[PDB]
Amino acid sequence: APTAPSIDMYGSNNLQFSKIELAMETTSGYNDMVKYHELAKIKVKFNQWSGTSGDTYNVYFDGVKVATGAITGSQTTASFEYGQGGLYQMEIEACDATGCSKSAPVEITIADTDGSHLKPLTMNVDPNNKSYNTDPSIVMGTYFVEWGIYGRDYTVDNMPVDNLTHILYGFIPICGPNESVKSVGGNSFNALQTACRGVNDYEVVIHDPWAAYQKSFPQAGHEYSTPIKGNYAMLMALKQRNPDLKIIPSIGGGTLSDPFYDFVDKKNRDTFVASVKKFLKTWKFYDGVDIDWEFPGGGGAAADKGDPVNDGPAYIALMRELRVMLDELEAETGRTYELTSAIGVGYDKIEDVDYADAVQYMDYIFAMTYDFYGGWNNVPGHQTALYCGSFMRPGQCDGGGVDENGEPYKGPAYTADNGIQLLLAQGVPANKLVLGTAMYGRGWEGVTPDTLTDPNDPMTGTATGKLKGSTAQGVWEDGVIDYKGIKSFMLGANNTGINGFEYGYDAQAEAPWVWNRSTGELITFDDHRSVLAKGNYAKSLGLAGLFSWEIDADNGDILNAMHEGMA
Template sequence: MSICSVNAWSAPGAPVIAWMPTEYTEGTAIPVNWNMWWGENGTSWVLTSNNSQVCAGDLTPNGNNAQMANCTISASAGTHQLQVVLSNAAGSSASAVKTVNVLSGNGTPPDPQPIPDPEFVEAPAKPVIAWMDTNQSAGDITVSWNMWWGVNGSSWTLESNGSEVCNNTLTVNGNNAQHGSCTVNFAKGSYDLQVLLTNAAGSTASDIKSISVGDAGGGVVGSSETPLPTDYSSPGLRRHKPYSNTTNSVVGAYFVEWGIYGRNYQPAQIPASNLTHLLYGFIPICGPNQSLQEANPSGYSALLQSCQGKQDFEVTVHDQYAALDKLYPGDNDAQDYKGVFNQLRRIKLANPDLVIVPSVGGWTLSDPFYYLDNAANRKVFVDSMVEFLKTYTFFDGVDIDWEYPGGGGANADLGKESDGETYVTLMQDLRIALDTLESETGRQYQLTSAVGVSPAKISQVDYAQASPYMDYIFAMSYDYYGAWSEDLGHHAGLYPTASAIHEGFSGDETVTNLLAAGVPAHKLAVGVAMYGRGWKGVSNMTSQDPFSGKGGGPISLTMNNGHWEAGVVDYFRIVQEMLGGDPNSSGVNGWSAGYDDSAKAPYVWKPSTGELITYENGKSAKTKAEYVRQRGLAGTFSWEIDADNGDILNAVHEGLGHPQE
């Protein structure tokens, strides 16, 4: 059956050119992908470069469903403005212009292009009101907007409930971005805000942003709009000291949902102003989760309850009480949600530059990733991730913790050679979705990923393909050795020792391997462990060095004050119980403290029982941070913040060269 005609009621929905690098070298094939997510379909499309057609194709309409296509072009050195035009019988719609620079073969940048004089043949591109909390206190409120690319305006106005409340003129600058802001005094009430961008050809309005304004100092929903600043004088902050991040290095840390229980570590204890990235672990994916079922049956039951009414491969919250329902001081039932999520919302208000991202996956929650090679499953996941960010607006992106593409994770039955390709495609799809969400909200969303660091795991992923879609890659440069094996070694050592059992099991080797695999140095963050790993019954030593022996299983410690998994000991407990409260002591209670200067790694050893713990301390963390600066890397991140007494994060800042405030 052939299609003879198409009745189009209106021109097609606007196409969007997918994310792509902004620079290429002459002679390089340049892939260009575009999508039209929803709207009247087109029957044909063309791609132009500097207004000249370079690709074209026909399309089969399918109602209002998404359309997409791609082609590969080559371009001479210079600046190229790419645009997709989607057409049907009723007309055409054009994408925003995507500008790429093609460098000459010797890497010489193209000559700068002159900015044309404005010719107001069409109204300006659509402005977007920047992210703002939708619940505000009465008083001065700043409203900002952006127009990322397109026809410029010569003036703009902000309207509240249809009445103008401020305006200003603009300097026209080709098709480059424009932005503005103003501060308005709002009384208690509800307001629909809209920005109009205007030139001689007309005006274009933003989407409406609705806000609720409550009593001054009180707000309409209690603590949800009250900032939660870091109080370094609080005993809950342990030994943390405030630092100024003068190098703009990444300083990240994971905060775990379950830490609010046995560890009694609450969000107010997070040294948020000392961080650039706060990663919330973990957000699960509905569907096949055998690893969780076997490791944590009660956690699996909670996940099944949270997934009721959801599709497989949608994200959800795991512990609804912890995330959304737990009452913290100042909370009340009028809030849209309470719990840790509201605490994070308040932390964001106090630290607007802090990037807070939900980390999806983790050791026992990675099973669903292996099924995302199916495009339909992947779309459900990506779409649900976008909805999650729209619902919990304090989050600033997505962190993917797939342990691990290719296998070797909690479920020994999962893992295949094509997982690396799935990982790259997943990053591409997430980047496209986040870029589209950015155009709707005016915010920026980061895409990060925690990655395996052994040579075998690094080889599973083509990071040269994946990294262009990602903001940062967090190398989990710890857990090189542990009590799952009798092999002894430093679990977070920076350098290999002369007697190292496994090649590639050190921070320096990991960094070298990831850089060689295509990860840009400025996107690579090195992991700092805030815990130790230990063995019992170490025997068969060939020297006084305990690492010359063999381990006899995970260390056995009483289950209190920071011991939560066999063979794992929190840093603060090592300091309290093995070092007598002084991280620089030689050891107490039969423990002897040591430091391997070749590996840049500390350990404690109890000869009478054959117990050995390898860990990180302030000295090793500072050295690792200094290494990060020397190699021009993005920064550091830590697992996990509740295990530190402040020593390690303080030392990271010292190593990065940050002055104490």
């Protein structure tokens, strides 16, 4: 006999509710912006405009009763709490002593960060990415960078997810000392200062909440009331489409590694470890953690930092304490959590960590088998070669000899193979090692013929400085160029060379280059041929697979070649 309630859809936040509460119109400290709740707070306004209102209401989701309260007027606000994310058919019933009247059913959304309230993501992948039937046991990883969504214009739905087992999401910073972030310029340190207000030193934070959970993406169907937007909501819809895809946050990275050096203090580690646990409880679509400490012992962005006695033991203690915390998350949730880590592979980086000790705690080690040479100095080299190139001096490859002063080589030359070998010799199992491919080149200006010691090898010349170019040609910073930029603007469709560039390949190193004799522009990179050699090298040794850095810079060719070389 009471009038059936009508739901005030707009008075009820359009029936979009959430276990996670996120600031949408603000940029502030992480703890101010992100609050995870065990139970979602649901607030539903309903009206009874004509007839009698009755005295009590009940709320049903999919026929189960989940709340009751008093009706006292022609307008009621039902507030209550609910613990499971998902879409539900909601009915509200108004009751009196003579009977009850149900509202017609209406869909209520309760978001959770596993994406249970979302449809599978809709893909928009360059069709230049082919299909493969690569053994599901082989690792095919890549990094997807948070800021890729700006100028580079590359979003989660552009990733060829069917050709990937692991997405590493770069990068999650740590609060605390971060001078190295400052040195980068832009808003980057400022944004980190903001994110860290009200947050303890050594805890993880989201760097760019706009890219991560605020930015509305039409292709994902985000609209004003959607409680989770940005890269994270798309990666949640992505997990719905490909539930076996591992998505892993990458913590640290080149410029974000300054706080790792205070991990020689166990309090700092405990703080960090506990913030990582909270982070994974907050963002349930993530499947583990990746530590990119560049680098234990030093030799990274922070010139004033690095302890070669203590950093290694701290790294190993860190991996153990992470795996302990991850064991508890597996306990509480029933899921498998992965612990991985990207590492430098120069002899001088390797010798500072007992990796055989650390790896027992870990699922994989992403060997950063790139950046061997680059625009930081005027010495050309293959940045991502497998083997020693022709340009190397006698005894340089193994570090047995002397340079042009007659100064002794301190250790084996920087090559992929030399790195993998050093890790195998320490006792790291082959099947935990993932070998890295570059989706970009590094480059130089001013390596003209008059500089060569061998007239057919520009790797024997001398540079004037870093390669300069525009973002239109894929140069996002000095000395670095996207692979798709090399292909469009230097190689051309036939891989023969265009705009003054020639294509060369060092068969001994397994490394391509492009060279413009007159500007002396020289770019070292990975192409189809050398990725095939890497896949072959990986098969040969029983390596876990391949990964790449970074996915937005590929046109399809590098990832394709990754799958082909593993076949």
